[PDB]
């Protein structure tokens, strides 16, 4: 399965590494990579932005049609062990990079420290700072399915999933 430009278009710079527009409204990222202090996001106002956040997961919900351009994609809790995503890895250079990964068990982690909710998987045949927010998706039936999003590596990746 070959992600479409419009998959990758949603992928967003934000803060110290990237984010998905999921829908119009909707938009997930690694906690640890998006601004604080800051009163508004794509400068909306905080107060129109309902916002989750547990385990480095991060979703933002708009109240004005962001990505108007896009359909609603299913959001889920990580994915079935064995699944095989791909890790949709924007550069600064504007280079994609695709990356096939086996997805392994959904478990709660420390990592450097922090505790992290998330998905592990195994590399298939790297990532590094910058990376964290790109969304890990797969294709099921008609639809693309994002599932979480990067948030640290080792061989093993390390997604941050919603609870």
């Known amino acids: 399965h070959m992600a479409p430009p419009t998959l990758w278009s949603r ?11 999921v829908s119009p409204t909707v ?13 508004e996001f794509f400068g909306e106002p905080l107060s129109s932005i309902a916002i989750h956040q ?14 108007p351009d896009l359909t609603g994609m299913v959001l889920e809790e990580g994915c079935p062990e064995g699944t095989v995503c791909s890790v949709l890895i924007k550069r600064d250079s504007g280079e994609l990079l695709p990356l096939a990964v086996r997805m392994g068990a959904i478990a709660s982690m420390r990592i450097q420290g ?4 998330g998905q592990s998987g195994m590399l298939l045949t790297g990532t590094i700072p910058g990376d964290c927010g790109a969304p890990y998706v797969h294709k099921r039936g008609n639809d693309w399915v994002v ?17």
């Open 11 to 21: 992928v967003t710079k934000f803060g110290s590494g990237w984010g998905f527009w």
């Open 114 to 117: 922090r505790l992290v909710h």
């Open 147 to 163: 599932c979480g999003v990067h948030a640290a590596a080792t061989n093993t990746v390390v997604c941050a999933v919603q609870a």
């Open 27 to 39: 938009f997930i990222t690694t906690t640890h990579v998006v601004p604080t202090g800051v009163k």
């Open 54 to 67: 547990a385990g480095e997961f991060t979703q933002f919900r708009f109240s004005k049609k962001m990505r």
